[PDB]
Structures are given as C-alpha cells and as structure tokens.
Ligand binder design. Structure first.
Ligand code: NA
Ligand code: NA
Length: 153
C-alpha cells in the first residue's frame, strides 16, 4: 500500500446554499482546504486552510467524511478529511488562486466540480457520513472507486 499525505476539505453548507471556491490558476469548484501541517490536529488544519483560502473563520467544524484519492502515476495517496459547518464568521474573500461563490442547493455545479463529488456530495447533503476511495487517471477519468455510508467517520 502506498503512503498517504493528509489533506482537509471544508464545505460551508447553509440551509439553502453552499459556498465553493473556483480554482483560478484549475477551473473547477471545490470546498476549501489543503495539506495538514506538522503539529496541528486535522480539525485545526481544516480551520486554518479555510481561513487562509477564503478568509472565513469558524471556531469549530463537524467531520462528515474521509476520501482517499489515488492518481495513476503518482506515488502517494491523498487522505482527505472532510468537514462541514453551517455557521459563519465574515465574508469570503477572493484571492489570486481562488474565487468564492455561493450556489443554491438546487444549482450545485456538479459538471464543474471534480467527478467524485457527484457521488459523495449527495450523502453530505442528507447528513450522512461517508468513507470513499477514488482512483483517477488524470483529472477526468475514474478507474475504480468505493463509497460507503458509515455511522462513525
Ligand atoms: Na489548497
Ligand atoms: Na473531489
């Protein structure tokens, strides 16, 4: 089994809308996140990346899933810990690398999101926790995947 590198992903999910960020430098909408750093808990890394990438703070996040990504031709797995919050402080801020935008929950831009999101995002919306794994060839093609609803992430 490959080694894995820890990443976070944060979905700001309100009753009627979700906040996503368009990768500028690319072209897909995503939640906010990045690599976990030495000496921080995963949840604190998720809060830090949300702030660094969107400007938003939150004192707390809820863990809702975990997704492992494997890319053909790459040595490591990405181990992505997925969090959500409904409660925000501040306005999101655009950067040179990310543009934040709200989407109504009947206009989730799945066609402009990574392909895996079509599978697990619906579970998140139903308040269901999940474990996933996706193997990609490049950015467009899934060769294998697993997904399961879990009671405990
Ligand atoms: Na990032
Ligand atoms: Na994704």
């Amino acid at each position: 089994m490959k080694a894995s590198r820890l990443y976070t992903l944060v979905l700001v999910l309100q009753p009627q809308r979700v906040l996503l960020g368009m990768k500028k430098r690319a072209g897909r909408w995503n939640g906010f996140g990045g690599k976990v750093q030495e000496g921080e808990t995963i949840e604190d890394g998720a809060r830090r990346e949300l702030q660094e990438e969107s400007g938003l703070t939150v004192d707390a996040l809820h863990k809702v899933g975990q997704i492992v990504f494997e890319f053909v031709g790459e040595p490591e797995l990405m181990d992505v810990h997925v969090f959500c919050t409904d409660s925000i402080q501040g306005t999101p801020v655009e950067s040179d690398e990310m543009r934040p935008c709200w989407f109504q929950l009947d206009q989730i831009p799945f066609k402009d999101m990574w392909p895996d999101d079509s599978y697990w995002f619906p579970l998140l919306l139903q308040k269901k926790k999940f474990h996933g794994y996706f193997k990609f060839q490049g950015q467009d093609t899934i060769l294998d995947y697993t997904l399961r609803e879990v009671d405990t992430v």
